[PDB]
Amino acid sequence: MENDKGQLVELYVPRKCSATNRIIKADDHASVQINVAKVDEEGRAIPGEYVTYALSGYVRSRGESDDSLNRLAQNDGLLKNVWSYSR
Amino acid sequence: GKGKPRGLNSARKLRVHRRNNRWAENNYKKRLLGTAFKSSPFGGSSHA
Amino acid sequence: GRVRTKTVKRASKALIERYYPKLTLDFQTNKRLCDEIATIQSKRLRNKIAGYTTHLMKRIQKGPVRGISFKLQEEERERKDQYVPEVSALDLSRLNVDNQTSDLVKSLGLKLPLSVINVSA
Amino acid sequence: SLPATFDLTPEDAQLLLAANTHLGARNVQVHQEPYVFNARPDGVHVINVGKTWEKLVLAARIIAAIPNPEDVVAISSRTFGQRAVLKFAAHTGATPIAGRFTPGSFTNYITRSFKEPRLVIVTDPRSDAQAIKEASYVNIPVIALTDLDSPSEFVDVAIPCNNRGKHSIGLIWYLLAREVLRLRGALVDRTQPWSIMPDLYFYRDP
Amino acid sequence: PKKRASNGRNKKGRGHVKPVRCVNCSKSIPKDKAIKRMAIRNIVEAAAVRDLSEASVYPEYALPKTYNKLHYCVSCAIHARIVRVRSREDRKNRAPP
Amino acid sequence: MRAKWRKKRTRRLKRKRRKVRARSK
Amino acid sequence: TRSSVLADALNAINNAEKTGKRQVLIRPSSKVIIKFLQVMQKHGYIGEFEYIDDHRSGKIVVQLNGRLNKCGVISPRFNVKIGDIEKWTANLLPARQFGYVILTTSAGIMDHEEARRKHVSGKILGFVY
Amino acid sequence: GWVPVTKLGRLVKAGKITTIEEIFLHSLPVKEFQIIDTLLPGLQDEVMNIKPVQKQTRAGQRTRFKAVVVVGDSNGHVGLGIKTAKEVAGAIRAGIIIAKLSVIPIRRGYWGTNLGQPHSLATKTTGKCGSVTVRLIPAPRGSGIVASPAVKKLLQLAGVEDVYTQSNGKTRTLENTLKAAFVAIGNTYGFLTPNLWAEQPLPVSPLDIYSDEASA
RNA sequence: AGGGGAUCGAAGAUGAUCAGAUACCGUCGUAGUCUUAACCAUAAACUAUGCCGACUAGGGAUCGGGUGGUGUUUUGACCCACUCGGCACCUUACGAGAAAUCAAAGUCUUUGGGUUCUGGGGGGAGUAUGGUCGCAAGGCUGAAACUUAAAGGAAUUG
RNA sequence: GAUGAUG
């Protein structure tokens, strides 16, 4: 949100849930952020290097968190045959 | 829906319905009955 | 009634966890130890403290008492926690699986020594 | 993407089939349906051990991302998992919670049990419900060993396994310990098995 | 307020349920609301079973039994200590003792 | 008083107004 | 009975969008339903959708994203003058920089700021913001 | 003095967190009131009202006092807190602390063209506590805060210059009206306007990039 | 108005209790209770919740019909899975509510799917009066003068 | 499962 001459006039731009695309407010305390370690050629983690995901409080409360992480992970190569689109 | 008509051609029912219920109000009831002139000792005057 | 208050219960507990090797079943011996190992304000309370410490000592001879632990006891415990049998119970002593369990192995593509047995409701 | 050596080996498949990590519950809830393979007569539902393994490595990779090993907390209120937890923490650097879980460990900051981890692992979401509930107030991710009927709310990475058996719970904890150490390099080679028998994790109550 | 979702009776999907009479006070109460107990006892009390065996002409005679089903109104069920006032959370329980 | 018995009283009162007034018909 | 098919379609989208779903199935389909969903799609609020033929007035499946906040109809389809559009947007839009009121006109189904460009007006249908 | 107990307080004291916007962005829990006054040094507090409450006993009425307190920067930060205590002074003193731990961010936008600085809210918002529902609508410049005295103060301390308000329900229970306004004003950052539709990489938590300093 | 009239039993008659007891308790007992013909039109007639339609969470039990399993004991009865239509029930709060609580009492200040009926502080009053229906008891329709600062709903500590 | 009104 800019003013008439291209200056951002916003306190901060919040994150968004990866599973549902909603805003993670300042006090969404069910919300979490997972870090998944990348693996080097030899087969051992590369410190500080992550594939990061966010899930909102709503998603986790309904019980969909596990399922929606399977989908995101597979789309990023971190799983092979866990999630099927044609349920 | 809520308990009133909503059609484009429902104006008649919404007029009549409101007219009937206005009588539950005290100001409307006393004014149109004309109880000021009929019964009030001052007969609607501010002083006597 | 001869119930003992928390001041007595905890002072006695605090002495066993530090002085098991030096404590004994004798009341007269324990009574004299508690003069040199604690600062208590009265003969009456000292006698009660030493009395209940003796009482717990008899208990420990019969077995572990809940909520009191001391060096000698725990060291034996951890040794019993390092146990590991001669051979794993999971080892293939001869593995039996159902028809549906066999179908799973085929789907994954693994080679195993299956033996198939039937089942019913 | 992971290399080809992370795939399921027949040696492992023997362990998973030997401890009956595949014999699940007679009733399955909707969220766990993907993990089912087929239905045996008598109602037992076989679990797809392939997804048990893949979910075990993925969980293992989240643990390895925590900078400090002490900020991983392992819980097991029920007995069949208490020995396992006390040994997961020993081999890795986790903080175990075996036995009673005092309400307010994660939300009350003047209690002697105060911990603020970056990840919690639990053995049974139905009996360790307090830890899951308290996690949701302070933004702590959760990993839970899950049966086909166990509840999944406020759980992020569920590892499907048969949790009604002594050997099954022990084995899953053992393999998380193994995979984590290999990732961190404490074990040099993935091809050679671990020198600690998995039965070190199993329960004993004579 | 509404004290119970069952309205203190087992009637759903019916208009009427025929009445029954209480076994103490004779007061009428719909069958579905009455408190019902099935009492069964030996015809000879425990103290007398021995003396009756000695007197029995027949050898190995099996003791008969008495069967009756008893209907109580709410007032007489409270008094006889057949049911008792119960706490709010404890009211929802359906299982026998 | 109880609603039922107040209703009764008004009924046994109307029944009497209804007949005293019948004397003038 | 089923009085408005556009009302049911927009209610199903709303219900699923609030429960985090990524797609819906709306039955039955209609010309006004497609044209409504084409204005929403143009402004980025739904994404792709597909029409299934079944010889029986048909079905649709609509992909969703998190963008949509609310969508719905105004019933009855009131008459709107060209000076009355400013009193409808003011009532049922969050702020006057984003949001649309979709209204059927002689030019076709459109949104209000297109109706200003083209200088047309007609019956109001619904809103999307 | 102050000796931090939580991880976040340790980083904040060390200076490795600089702006309160990082805490909001990652939605970290704030449990020590010193974290707030070390990052928002300009907060000012106004005490709304003090009311007595009573419970009966064998020997009469036990009486305590209940205070409402609002803390704010007047530049986009407000907090609301309530506490009951045996002394009026202790109620106010504890009311300021609870108020600080509940600071939330506000969003401000334009009524019309984006000329100059933000002055009002970006979108209509509603909040409810008990029966009282408060609604906030953007207003042009020069309108001011058109609200009752109590709700007006809390909107001044969040930095809103021009805003309309409408209310429904039993407003005279001031605790609910102020708590309903607080929900309405904090909801402004949950509304996904179309200028936020762009995708941003998720930042790495400060609690993870400064792990060493957090533990000690 | 005929028939029937055993039991129970407004009225009524009696014994006891009591300061009184034209009440509760014990014993009698007419109308009634049952049926045919013809009236009456009311109830806490209650789920204190109008009807048609679409959509939104988990678990199991049961009633009726149908499909698959040549399932298993002797077409039928059972058993496993599935499905349509019912009476309901257990857990939860995305949601609703002043709360009790609610899978509808949700998808309502982000207020519009169609439609019908009723309410406007407590009393006077469901009263007076005029119509209309009934053999009668009464039913439907239904005010005003005047009086009043509180009546009331759900929860909380005593 | 006898009696027990009022301030």
Structure tokens at G78: 């009131």
Contact present, D163 and D52 (Cβ < 8 Å): no
In angstroms, rounded to a whole number, what is the distance separating the alpha carbons of residues C40 and C34? 8
Residue where one domain finishes, among candidates G15, G45, G68: G68
- The answer for residues whose C-beta is within 8 angstroms of residue H104's C-beta and 6 or more apart is A26, A27, H24, H77, H78, H79, H182, H185, H186, H189
Contact present, G39 and G128 (Cβ < 8 Å): yes
What's the first-to-final CA gap in chain B, in angstroms?
54
- The answer for residues whose C-beta is within 8 angstroms of residue E53's C-beta and 6 or more apart is E61
CB count, 10 Å around CB of D184?
Answer: 18
A56 at D interface, C-beta within 8 A: no
Across the interface, whether the CB atoms of H31 and D68 are under 8 A apart is answered no
Structure tokens at E45: 């009390």
Chain D interface disruption, residue of H3, H5, H8, most D CBs within 10 A: H5
Residues G63 and G96 reside in one and the same domain: no
- The answer for residues whose C-beta is within 8 angstroms of residue H210's C-beta and 6 or more apart is H11, H16
Across the interface, whether the CB atoms of B8 and G75 are under 8 A apart is answered no
Phi-psi region of G98 (alpha: psi -120 to 50; beta: other; left: phi over 0): beta
Strands H60-72 and H77-85: antiparallel
Contact present, D101 and D77 (Cβ < 8 Å): yes
Contact present, G49 and G107 (Cβ < 8 Å): no
Q: In Å, how far are B5, B15, G56, G122, G128 from B9, measured between CA atoms?
A: 9, 12, 31, 18, 27
Residues G90 and G57 reside in one and the same domain: no
Name the residue facing H122 among G66, G67, G95 (closest C-beta). G95
Which amino acid is present at H86?
A: K
Please report which helix (H) or strand (E) contains residue G7, including its range: helix G5-18
Which amino acid is present at H21?
A: E
- The answer for residues whose C-beta is within 8 angstroms of residue C28's C-beta and 6 or more apart is none
Phi-psi region of D102 (alpha: psi -120 to 50; beta: other; left: phi over 0): beta
Among candidate residues H86, H89, H123, the one with its CA nearest the CA of residue H106? H123
Residue of chain G whose Cα is closest to the Cα of B6:
G76
- The answer for residues whose C-beta is within 8 angstroms of residue H165's C-beta and 6 or more apart is H134, H135, H136, H137, H145, H146, H147, H148, H151, H155
Contact present, D49 and D96 (Cβ < 8 Å): no
Across the interface, whether the CB atoms of H116 and A28 are under 8 A apart is answered no
Beta strand segments in A40-87, E: 45-55
Residues G88 and G26 reside in one and the same domain: no
In angstroms, rounded to a whole number, what is the distance separating the alpha carbons of residues C116 and H64? 76
CB count, 10 Å around CB of C52?
Answer: 18
What is the separation of C-alpha A58 from the centre of its chain, rounded to a whole number of angstroms? 14
Q: Which residues of D66-90 are buried (b: 16+ CB within 10 A; e: fewer)?
A: bbeeebbbbbbbeebbbbbbbbbbe
Q: Among all strands, which nt has the closest C1' to E80 (CA)?
A: J1
Q: Report, at the CATH architecture level, how domain H1-105 is classified.
A: 2-Layer Sandwich (3.30)
Which amino acid is present at G97?
A: Q
Interrupted backbone of chain C, residues before each interruption (C–N > 2.5 Å): 94
G23 touches strand I (CB under 7 A): no
Among candidate residues C87, C89, C111, C114, the one with its CA nearest the CA of residue C100? C114
* Set of chain A residues whose Cβ sits within 8 Å of the Cβ of G66: 16-17, 20-22
D151 occurs within a structural domain:
yes
Q: E39-48 long-range contacts, Cβ below 8 Å, gap at least 24?
A: E39/E66, E39/E67, E39/E68, E39/E69, E39/E70, E40/E65, E40/E66, E40/E67, E41/E65, E41/E66, E42/E66
Q: What angle (nearest 5°) sits at the alpha carbon of residue H63, between those of residues H62 and H68?
A: 145
| Secondary-structure percent of chain D, ordered helix, strand, coil, rounded to 5 | 40, 15, 45
Q: Among all strands, which nt has the closest C1' to H136 (CA)?
A: I109
In angstroms, rounded to a whole number, what is the distance separating the alpha carbons of residues A14 and H23? 11
- Residue C114: strand, helix, or coil: coil
D188 touches strand I (CB under 7 A): no
Name the residue ranges covered by the structural domains of chain A: 1-87
In angstroms, rounded to a whole number, what is the distance separating the alpha carbons of residues H38 and H41? 6
- Residue G84: strand, helix, or coil: coil
Scan residues 16-35 of chain B and list those with Cβ within 7 Å of strand I: 21, 24-26, 29-30, 33, 35
Structure tokens at C65: 């008492």
Across the interface, whether the CB atoms of C119 and D40 are under 8 A apart is answered yes
Q: Among all strands, which nt has the closest C1' to D33 (CA)?
A: I58
* Set of chain H residues whose Cβ sits within 8 Å of the Cβ of G97: 109-110
Strands C96-97 and C115-116: parallel
Please report which helix (H) or strand (E) contains residue H174, including its range: helix H174-186
- Residue E66: strand, helix, or coil: strand
Q: In Å, how far are A76, D150, G20, H28, H100 from A33, measured between CA atoms?
A: 16, 24, 18, 11, 26
Across the interface, whether the CB atoms of A4 and H113 are under 8 A apart is answered yes
In angstroms, rounded to a whole number, what is the distance separating the alpha carbons of residues H210 and H216? 11
C83 at D interface, C-beta within 8 A: yes
In angstroms, rounded to a whole number, what is the distance separating the alpha carbons of residues H175 and H81? 10
Strands G71-73 and G123-128: antiparallel
What is the separation of C-alpha B35 from the centre of its chain, rounded to a whole number of angstroms? 14
Query: Tell me, what CATH number does G83's domain have?
Result: 3.30.1490.10
E25 touches strand J (CB under 7 A): yes
Residues G1 and G63 reside in one and the same domain: yes
D188 at C interface, C-beta within 8 A: no
In angstroms, rounded to a whole number, what is the distance separating the alpha carbons of residues G11 and G71? 8
Chain D interface disruption, residue of A55, A66, A85, most D CBs within 10 A: A66
Q: In what order do the strands lie in the sheet with D95-98?
A: D95-98, D72-76, D119-122, D142-146, D157-160
Provide the positions of strand J that have an atom within 7 A of a protein CB: 1
Which amino acid is present at G118?
A: K
Scan residues 87-106 of chain H and list those with Cβ within 7 Å of strand I: none
Residue where one domain finishes, among candidates G68, G100, G119: G68
Please report which helix (H) or strand (E) contains residue B7, including its range: none
CA–C1' span, E14 to I135, in Å? 38
- Burial label for F15, CB within 10 Å (0-12, 13-18, 19+), is exposed
Contact present, D170 and D199 (Cβ < 8 Å): yes
Among candidate residues D58, D19, D23, D57, the one with its CA nearest the CA of residue D148? D23
CA–C1' span, A28 to I94, in Å? 15
**Among all chains, which residue has been given the structure tokens 């019964």?**
B39
What's the first-to-final CA gap in chain C, in angstroms?
61
Across the interface, whether the CB atoms of A55 and D156 are under 8 A apart is answered yes
DSSP code string of D20-40: TSSB--SS--GGGGGGEEEE-
Structure tokens at B43: 């007969």
Among candidate residues H122, H186, H136, the one with its CA nearest the CA of residue A9? H122
Identify any residues that bridge with H46 across adjacent strands, giving them in sequence order: H70
Positive or negative, the CA dihedral H82, H87, H93, H94 is negative
Total tally of structural domains belonging to chain D: 1
Structure tokens at H161: 């210059």
Strands E19-21 and D157-160: unpaired
In angstroms, rounded to a whole number, what is the distance separating the alpha carbons of residues B7 and G76? 6
- The answer for residues whose C-beta is within 8 angstroms of residue H189's C-beta and 6 or more apart is A14, A23, A25, A26, H104, H105, H106, H107
Q: Considering just the CA atoms, what is the radius of gyration of chain C in Å?
A: 28
Scan residues 147-166 of chain H and list those with Cβ within 7 Å of strand I: 166
* Nearest residue to I155 via alpha carbon and C1': E1
A23 at H interface, C-beta within 8 A: yes
What is the separation of C-alpha D156 from the centre of its chain, rounded to a whole number of angstroms? 12
Residues G3 and G55 reside in one and the same domain: yes
In angstroms, rounded to a whole number, what is the distance separating the alpha carbons of residues A33 and A16? 11
Name the residue facing A3 among H107, H116, H208 (closest C-beta). H116
Positive or negative, the CA dihedral A48, A52, A57, A61 is negative
Q: Which residues of H154-186 are buried (b: 16+ CB within 10 A; e: fewer)?
A: bbbbbbbbbbbbeeebebeebbbbbbbbbbbbb
Q: Which fold has domain A1-87?
A: Hypothetical Cytosolic Protein; Chain: A; (3.30.1230)
- Residue G111: strand, helix, or coil: strand
Residues G6 and G57 reside in one and the same domain: yes
Q: Among all strands, which nt has the closest C1' to F3 (CA)?
A: I126
- The answer for residues whose C-beta is within 8 angstroms of residue A48's C-beta and 6 or more apart is none
In angstroms, rounded to a whole number, what is the distance separating the alpha carbons of residues D35 and D54? 11
In angstroms, rounded to a whole number, what is the distance separating the alpha carbons of residues C81 and G3? 73
The values of phi and psi at residue H156, to 5°, are -65, -40
Residues G2 and G55 reside in one and the same domain: yes
In angstroms, rounded to a whole number, what is the distance separating the alpha carbons of residues A21 and H195? 14
Which amino acid is present at H83?
A: K
D4 occurs within a structural domain:
no
Phi-psi region of H101 (alpha: psi -120 to 50; beta: other; left: phi over 0): alpha
Q: For chain D, positions 99-158, list CB contacts with chain A under 8 A.
A: 136-141, 146, 151-158
- The answer for residues whose C-beta is within 8 angstroms of residue D183's C-beta and 6 or more apart is A37, A39, A43, A44, A45, D60, D61, D64
F12 touches strand I (CB under 7 A): yes
E76 touches strand J (CB under 7 A): yes
Helices (H), C1-121: 6-19, 27-37, 43-62, 71-81, 99-108
In angstroms, rounded to a whole number, what is the distance separating the alpha carbons of residues D117 and D120? 7
Structure tokens at E5: 């979702």
Domain that holds residue G106: 69-129
Domains of chain E: 1-97 (3.30.1740.20)
In angstroms, rounded to a whole number, what is the distance separating the alpha carbons of residues D49 and D7? 12
Write out the residues of chain G at the interface with chain A, using a CB-CB cutoff of 8 A: 19-20, 65-67
Q: In Å, how far are D140, H26, H28, H65 from H23, measured between CA atoms?
A: 16, 6, 5, 33
A55 at D interface, C-beta within 8 A: yes
Q: Considering just the CA atoms, what is the radius of gyration of chain E in Å?
A: 19
Domain that holds residue D149: 10-200
Neighbours of chain E (3+ CB pairs under 8 A): none
Total tally of structural domains belonging to chain G: 2
What's the count of helices (H) and strands (E) in chain A, helices before strands?
2, 2
Is the peptide bond prior to E97 cis by the omega test (within 30 degrees of 0)? no
Positive or negative, the CA dihedral H20, H22, H27, H33 is negative
Interrupted backbone of chain D, residues before each interruption (C–N > 2.5 Å): none
Q: Among all strands, which nt has the closest C1' to E79 (CA)?
A: J1
E75 touches strand I (CB under 7 A): no
Interrupted backbone of chain A, residues before each interruption (C–N > 2.5 Å): none
CB count, 10 Å around CB of G101?
Answer: 23
Across the interface, whether the CB atoms of H111 and G67 are under 8 A apart is answered no
**Among all chains, which residue has been given the structure tokens 């959708």?**
G49
In angstroms, rounded to a whole number, what is the distance separating the alpha carbons of residues A29 and H29? 7
Q: In Å, how far are A56, G9, G11, H153 from G64, measured between CA atoms?
A: 18, 13, 14, 41
In angstroms, rounded to a whole number, what is the distance separating the alpha carbons of residues H163 and H123? 11
Residues G17 and G77 reside in one and the same domain: no
Among candidate residues H140, H127, H83, H118, the one with its CA nearest the CA of residue H195? H118
Which residues in chain H are classed under CATH 3.30.230.10?
106-199
Helices (H), chain E: 49-55, 74-79, 88-91
Residue where one domain finishes, among candidates G46, G68, G90: G68
Please report which helix (H) or strand (E) contains residue E30, including its range: strand E28-30
Structure tokens at H99: 């108020």
In angstroms, rounded to a whole number, what is the distance separating the alpha carbons of residues G32 and G104? 9
Count CA atoms within 13 Å of residue H160 on its CB side.
37
In angstroms, rounded to a whole number, what is the distance separating the alpha carbons of residues C47 and C45? 5
- Residue G104: strand, helix, or coil: strand
Among candidate residues D169, D200, D172, the one with its CA nearest the CA of residue D80? D169
D136 touches strand I (CB under 7 A): no
Structure tokens at D122: 């639990």
Among candidate residues D91, D71, D109, D80, the one with its CA nearest the CA of residue D178? D91
CB count, 10 Å around CB of H21?
Answer: 16
Across the interface, whether the CB atoms of D183 and A43 are under 8 A apart is answered yes
CATH code given to domain H106-199: 3.30.230.10
Which residues in chain H are classed under CATH 3.30.160.20?
1-105
- The answer for residues whose C-beta is within 8 angstroms of residue H183's C-beta and 6 or more apart is H127, H128, H129
Across the interface, whether the CB atoms of G95 and H197 are under 8 A apart is answered no
- Give the closest-approach CA distance of B18 to chain G in angstroms: 20
* Set of chain H residues whose Cβ sits within 8 Å of the Cβ of D110: 5
Across the interface, whether the CB atoms of H138 and G95 are under 8 A apart is answered yes
In angstroms, rounded to a whole number, what is the distance separating the alpha carbons of residues G91 and C27? 90
D75 occurs within a structural domain:
yes
* Set of chain B residues whose Cβ sits within 8 Å of the Cβ of G77: 8
